[PDB]
Design a protein around this nucleic acid. Structure first.
Length: 530
RNA sequence: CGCUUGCUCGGUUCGCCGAGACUCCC
């Protein structure tokens, strides 16, 4: 019930003394990565006893012989080794869950056919994790507002903690024609009355005008003789949008132990325990809480990605159905074409990656579907007198023709011919297809962007659903009831249809289900999964 | 009543405007 969640807040970095690679705090954290990511499985159990104690840290470096490059400090050296231990442990934990996926799928796969009819030899983990030089800051180096008097005096700005920060622009309509920032004469009567986030700079008009944004709210982080400054404007967006809204008061909301990503160029702050009043929860099968309560039955219909029978329920009544607006479906349809255009384009390159001998099998399982069906004719002994289009799910006419032959009489077994001679991709080639395809999906800029947009649209749909439920059902408690996707219609009579798959689905099926389940943790909205 | 940076998708003879997400990381 108490708020036990801490969302992230991202912060832009202005300037650095010297690159973070040369910092001693990170440099020691690289010697705790060559060793802790290369020792055998038996060795890890031997070296896991080093913790908050002062003498315990310095004793390890005597044994492991990892050079402590001047970074002799406690309360900041534990975070150097805890995350490497967790990352080392997390990799093994990841393989255990992966094996469960194979094991669980193995039971279903054999039953479906039945009804029809990573440490290696050395002990060190293979594919060992990379060096992440993110600097894990700590409370003793808690960021503070910049002051030109005591700091390096970098030329950006100054800070008045007692006085509030300045508004973006006052009286946007009042600015003359020459000074940027006023509403033009052709755009006057189309202004929003809502409380949207007012923006000033990035419209790509003079986006390169670096003196623009810099003319700023600086806060400083200094480890030893190495310092860095960033922008509190990032903190300001979060404090305003989230509704929790003095620079010290702004820094007081967030934590003094952020993460300094060198490559990303962004620092990641974490809220305090009570800064965001959201309780991370877990899906409940039933009887979550007797506790009116607004209940939404998210049905993932084929026609519309979301469909919701709003119902007002009470302890010891349908309110109608509202699905989605035209514009949002248009955006999803816009993304449908956006996501599709990349997939076959990326998937086409997968065949290019696959060797000439290994790409040959893919041609058979796809283009030759009928060719293997031509063999199916010979094995079943069926003739051409029975047209392919004549068949439907009621395919007993084959059995009648099969009984006419009688050589093979696989009809009396335990039941629920299509799958029995249906070929499948060879395992050795399969593992080449998926991995290579994965390699490009993690190396293509477009796909990573679309994955971000996929999730943003996922929350857009759940935001619309909860907002409508709060409005249409007039309730404060939103109890979401999604359908379990662990085990999930068209009837074209042609044989080709049986080969054709993907019933206009699986675009957002996995995405809304994980997104809706995330509302239990990220927002604390109950999710009664069933 | 109530939002300066970063990011997503929109309209514009270019001033600017309409909307969206924010639990992150490996």
């Amino acid at each position: 019930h108490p708020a036990n969640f801490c969302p992230p807040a991202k912060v832009n970095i202005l300037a650095q003394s010297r690159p973070l690679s040369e910092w001693p705090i990170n440099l020691v954290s690289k010697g705790v990565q060559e060793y802790v990511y290369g020792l055998t499985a038996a060795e890890r159990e031997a070296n896991g006893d080093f913790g908050t104690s002062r003498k315990s840290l310095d004793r390890w470096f005597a044994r492991t012989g990892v050079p402590t490059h001047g970074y002799t400090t406690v309360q900041g050296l534990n975070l150097i080794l805890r995350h490497t231990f967790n990352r080392y442990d997390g990799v093994i934990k990841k393989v255990e869950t992966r094996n469960e996926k194979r094991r669980s799928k193995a039971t279903r796969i054999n039953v479906s056919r039945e009804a029809d009819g990573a440490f290696g030899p050395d002990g060190k983990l293979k594919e060992r994790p990379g060096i992440n030089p993110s600097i894990y800051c700590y409370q003793q180096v808690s960021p503070v507002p910049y002051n030109p008097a005591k700091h390096p005096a970098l030329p950006f700005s100054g800070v008045d903690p007692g006085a509030p920060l300045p508004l973006g622009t006052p009286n946007r309509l009042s600015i003359p024609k020459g000074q940027p920032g006023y509403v033009p004469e052709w755009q006057r009567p189309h202004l929003s009355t809502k409380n949207k986030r007012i923006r000033k700079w990035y419209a790509r008009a003079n986006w390169r005008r670096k003196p623009g944004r810099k003319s700023a709210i600086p806060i400083i982080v200094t480890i030893g003789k190495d310092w860095i400054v960033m922008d509190a404007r990032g903190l300001l967006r979060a404090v305003y949008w989230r509704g929790i809204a003095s620079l010290k008061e702004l820094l007081g909301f967030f934590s003094g132990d952020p993460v300094l990503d060198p490559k990303r160029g962004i620092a990641t702050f974490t809220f305090k325990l009570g800064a965001v009043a959201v309780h991370s929860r877990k899906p409940t099968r039933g009887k979550k809480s007797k506790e009116h309560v607004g209940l939404v039955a998210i049905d993932l219909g084929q026609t519309n990605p979301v469909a919701a029978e709003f119902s007002r329920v009470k302890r010891e009544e349908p309110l109608g159905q509202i699905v989605l607006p035209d514009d949002l479906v248009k955006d999803l349809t816009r993304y449908r074409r956006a996501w599709d255009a990349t997939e076959e384009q990326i998937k086409a390159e997968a065949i290019v990656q696959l060797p000439e001998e290994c790409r040959a099998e893919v041609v058979k399982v796809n283009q030759m579907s009928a060719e293997e069906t031509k063999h199916l004719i010979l094995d079943r002994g069926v003739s051409g007198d029975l047209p392919w289009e004549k068949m439907t799910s009621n395919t007993t006419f084959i059995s009648d023709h099969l009984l006419a032959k009688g050589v093979t009489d696989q009809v009396f077994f335990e039941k629920k011919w299509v799958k029995l001679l249906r070929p499948r991709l060879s395992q050795e080639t399969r593992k080449a297809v998926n991995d290579k395809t994965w390699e490009l999906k993690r190396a293509s800029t477009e796909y990573v962007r679309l994955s971000r947009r996929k999730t943003e649209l996922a929350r857009r749909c759940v935001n619309y659903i909860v907002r409508e439920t709060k409005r249409w059902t007039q309730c404060e408690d939103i109890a979401i009831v999604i359908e379990d996707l662990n085990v999930r219609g068209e009837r074209p009579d042609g044989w080709d249809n049986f080969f054709i798959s993907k019933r206009e689905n699986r675009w957002f099926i996995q995405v809304l289900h994980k997104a809706f389940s995330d509302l239990a943790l990220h927002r604390g909205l109950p999710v009664i999964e069933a």
